[PDB]
Amino acid sequence: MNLTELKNTPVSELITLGENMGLENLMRKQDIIFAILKQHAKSGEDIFGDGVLEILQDGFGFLRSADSSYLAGPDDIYVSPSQIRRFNLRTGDTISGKIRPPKEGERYFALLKVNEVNFDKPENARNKILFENLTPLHANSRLRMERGNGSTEDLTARVLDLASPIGRGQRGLIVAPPKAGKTMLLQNIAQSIAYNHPDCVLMVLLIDERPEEVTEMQRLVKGEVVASTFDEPASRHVQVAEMVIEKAKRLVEHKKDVIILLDSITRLARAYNTVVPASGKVLTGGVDANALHRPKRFFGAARNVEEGGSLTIIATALIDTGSKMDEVIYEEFKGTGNMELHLSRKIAEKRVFPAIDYNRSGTRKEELLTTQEELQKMWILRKIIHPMGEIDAMEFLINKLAMTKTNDDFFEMMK
Amino acid sequence: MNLTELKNTPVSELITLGENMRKQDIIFAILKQHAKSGEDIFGDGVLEILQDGFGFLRSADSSYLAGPDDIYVSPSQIRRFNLRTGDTISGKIRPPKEGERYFALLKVNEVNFDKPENARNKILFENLTPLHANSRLRMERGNGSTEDLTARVLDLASPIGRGQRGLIVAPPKAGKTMLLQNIAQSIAYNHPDCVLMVLLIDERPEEVTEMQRLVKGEVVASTFDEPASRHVQVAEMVIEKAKRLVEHKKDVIILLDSITRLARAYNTVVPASGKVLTGGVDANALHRPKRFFGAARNVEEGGSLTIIATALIDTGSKMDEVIYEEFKGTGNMELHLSRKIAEKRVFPAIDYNRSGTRKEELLTTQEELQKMWILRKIIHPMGEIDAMEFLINKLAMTKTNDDFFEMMK
RNA sequence: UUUUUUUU
Numbered sequence A: 001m002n003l004t005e006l007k008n009t010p011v012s013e014l015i016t017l018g019e020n021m022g023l024e025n026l027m028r029k030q031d032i033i034f035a036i037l038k039q040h041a042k043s044g045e046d047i048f049g050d051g052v053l054e055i056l057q058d059g060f061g062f063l064r065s066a067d068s069s070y071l072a073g074p075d076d077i078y079v080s081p082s083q084i085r086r087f088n089l090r091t092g093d094t095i096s097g098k099i100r101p102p103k104e105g106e107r108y109f110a111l112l113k114v115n116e117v118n119f120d121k122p123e124n125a126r127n128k129i130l131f132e133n134l135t136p137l138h139a140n141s142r143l144r145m146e147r148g149n150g151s152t153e154d155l156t157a158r159v160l161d162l163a164s165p166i167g168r169g170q171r172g173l174i175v176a177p178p179k180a181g182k183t184m185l186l187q188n189i190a191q192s193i194a195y196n197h198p199d200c201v202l203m204v205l206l207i208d209e210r211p212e213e214v215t216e217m218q219r220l221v222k223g224e225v226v227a228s229t230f231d232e233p234a235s236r237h238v239q240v241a242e243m244v245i246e247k248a249k250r251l252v253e254h255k256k257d258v259i260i261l262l263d264s265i266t267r268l269a270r271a272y273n274t275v276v277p278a279s280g281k282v283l284t285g286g287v288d289a290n291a292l293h294r295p296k297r298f299f300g301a302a303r304n305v306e307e308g309g310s311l312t313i314i315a316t317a318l319i320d321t322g323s324k325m326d327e328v329i330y331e332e333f334k335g336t337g338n339m340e341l342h343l344s345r346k347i348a349e350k351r352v353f354p355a356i357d358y359n360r361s362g363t364r365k366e367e368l369l370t371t372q373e374e375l376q377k378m379w380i381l382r383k384i385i386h387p388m389g390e391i392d393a394m395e396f397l398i399n400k401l402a403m404t405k406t407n408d409d410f411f412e413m414m415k
Numbered sequence B: 001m002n003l004t005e006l007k008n009t010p011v012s013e014l015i016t017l018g019e020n021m022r023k024q025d026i027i028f029a030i031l032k033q034h035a036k037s038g039e040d041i042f043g044d045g046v047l048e049i050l051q052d053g054f055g056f057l058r059s060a061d062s063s064y065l066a067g068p069d070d071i072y073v074s075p076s077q078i079r080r081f082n083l084r085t086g087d088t089i090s091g092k093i094r095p096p097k098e099g100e101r102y103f104a105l106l107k108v109n110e111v112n113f114d115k116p117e118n119a120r121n122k123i124l125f126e127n128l129t130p131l132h133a134n135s136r137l138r139m140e141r142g143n144g145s146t147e148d149l150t151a152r153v154l155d156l157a158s159p160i161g162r163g164q165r166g167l168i169v170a171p172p173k174a175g176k177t178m179l180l181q182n183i184a185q186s187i188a189y190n191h192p193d194c195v196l197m198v199l200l201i202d203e204r205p206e207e208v209t210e211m212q213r214l215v216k217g218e219v220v221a222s223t224f225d226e227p228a229s230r231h232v233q234v235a236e237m238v239i240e241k242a243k244r245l246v247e248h249k250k251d252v253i254i255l256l257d258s259i260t261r262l263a264r265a266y267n268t269v270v271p272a273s274g275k276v277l278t279g280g281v282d283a284n285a286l287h288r289p290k291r292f293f294g295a296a297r298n299v300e301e302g303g304s305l306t307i308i309a310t311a312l313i314d315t316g317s318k319m320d321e322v323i324y325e326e327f328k329g330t331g332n333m334e335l336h337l338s339r340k341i342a343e344k345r346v347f348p349a350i351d352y353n354r355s356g357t358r359k360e361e362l363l364t365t366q367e368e369l370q371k372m373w374i375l376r377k378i379i380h381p382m383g384e385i386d387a388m389e390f391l392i393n394k395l396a397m398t399k400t401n402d403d404f405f406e407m408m409k
Numbered sequence C: 001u002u003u004u005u006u007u008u
């Protein structure tokens, strides 16, 4: 008997289930769940709820739900300050426990006992090392994207491993003009993560992008999808993004390998510039002087932790939009991240995919994510591709890789 | 028994030692019972004089910011030895009496690692007579490693001397930080005498811990997770500590990364004057970082202050162009790194033609400068990439720039 | 008014 489980089930099964208990005529869907929960409480049976914690300024908090993009919701579960102090809870902590309907003079479900804090024992949460105190590091463990199934979509993953490898805790960018292939390449990334790295906690944050891409992503990726389309204001974009990044930080505190696929971070950087207080100083392109400190900390949250776990963020960026702002935002994030995979519009207009700008792509300290021979073969491959043009490079590399199933067999053939 | 020593020792020691006798409470109790025994207590830190007259010995673990374990310094002690912000002080300390919240300083044993009575009367930093760098700080190791190529090309392109005021100018991902890391290793390799300080301002956290583990010196960091107000304060303490050591005839070298983002931090804190330069830079924002960078200088009296700081260009923001060109009119050494060279994966990605050091004849022998001048004319007609691929390969044949000059003739 | 836009 769980609240969010009742919210997921269709209304048809809820109305039928409510009639089995013997209730009055079945009112809006939200009322069906509420009336069913109350009747179950009358029997003496226990009730359960869950959600990500958000501590308000007064000291208490609520358990936001994913169906509201972790925003204020009618089914939020109140968390008393005493409960927060007892287990050292902070914003982002996923909480599950027994709940009770609101009494007379109350408007929210209350939390009686917390069973699980971040998918673990509540006691283990009391003693922990905070995210701000974790010792940072360069990416060590390689997150190989290559399927190896000889698929035609696998070409994008294979070229990615050769141009700019991705490790745990990476802070990368999929930089390209509109319609170059950023979103689908991000989708291609989500598929390889779900297949090759099911151990990682995969999240897909969609900020100020197309709505049909939201449903396409949530029915394609094997993970959680938090979205805030361009139908939403910048105020919502920021708040939604803040909740996701804090939930990631909390899981990293539990030695988890979290991956955040952001699209787009340039749209998110614009959102911050919309809500930022005017400083009297504006950068070239119309970007406030203090507007990029917030998005830089969001993107900068991604990091490799020595104590355990990691936070990876692969976000898409826009360039050559005619607006200098996007060049400033991109260059600022490049001075923050450690990996950039460029996509060329010139290649995309020839319908050559993946339309990857090989020379401009790359990863920092890639020797820590590749074997000694792998790096030496990638190093030689770049020297050969560099003199080529943008299009000739991809047409050459894709035709060579298509001859074999894996890059390892391609390297053996390369000899 | 020193307080700093007791803060570095693990908690297990405080337990075992405590039986023989929070971490802030235990250390406080152990030291408190050391005074009743009559035995002396010691502590250390960097002094910061507040506006009222008294001061506090800040700790390096708190990045020289306000700390719970800071040591109060009486105003009388400041007058008796002419102490100023930045002085490193060690001495006997006493646990706070009732009504006090901090340990107190009884008497100073060492002021900047010297005797207090001798630091009382010395020529101030603002009174030292400046000069152009006339003492060469050779970067080349001569071990034959691939990492030495950066140092060798650096010696040929832009020699660094004691008191230099240089810049590692380049766009993002060109190789500024690792260029800076290579410089730190050569200073610890060839110049153990110089006091090496590494100031990391508004940069990546992973580069902080990485720096700390490969550099033989002090690492003061303030990552981009920190406010601009913290950047300034931390940078103010480091530059003042450097000035104090220079007053003691010591060769201090500060490797900053990045100074461009430090200038941004000053621009965020600076009061609005109503006049804003092109790019969003307040007309008074650059004064503070300009006197920070301009603090570096060669001193005739003895010792010097060297500052090699990285700078950003081609960021799409006219602000960084104003900042870079302003520091260029302040410094006297510039090492540019090219993005198109780094994108071809040619390291070091040094723009040979646009790099150089002022008054380089004071840092090189007459024969050495001749060969550098000849090598200059040969490389100039070449393109950026071809220049590096040419110089790197010719240096690869040799282990030392001296044997490379022998092949020249 | 400055910065942003003009503007490269």
Ligand SMILES: Nc1ncnc2c1ncn2[C@@H]1O[C@H](COP(=O)(O)OP(=O)(O)O)[C@@H](O)[C@H]1O
Binding pocket: A335, A363, A364, A365, A366, B150, B170, B171, B172, B173, B174, B175, B176, B177, B178, B179, B347, B348
């Ligand atoms: N001398 C070098 N040798 C090999 N790789 C280098 C060198 N200099 C820079 N790189 C590459 O560039 C990447 C980032 O360069 P970095 O020093 O961060 O430039 P910046 O500080 O200007 O951002 C590193 O991960 C490294 O792989």
Ligand code: BEF
Binding pocket: A177, A178, A179, A180, A182, A183, A318
């Ligand atoms: F139009 Be694309 F998604 F940048």
Ligand code: BEF
Binding pocket: A334, A335, A336, B171, B172, B173, B174, B176, B177, B312
């Ligand atoms: F991104 Be670099 F460190 F400027």
Ligand SMILES: [Mg+2]
Binding pocket: A179, A182, A183, A184
């Ligand atoms: Mg898209």
Ligand SMILES: [Mg+2]
Binding pocket: B176, B177, B178
């Ligand atoms: Mg750098």
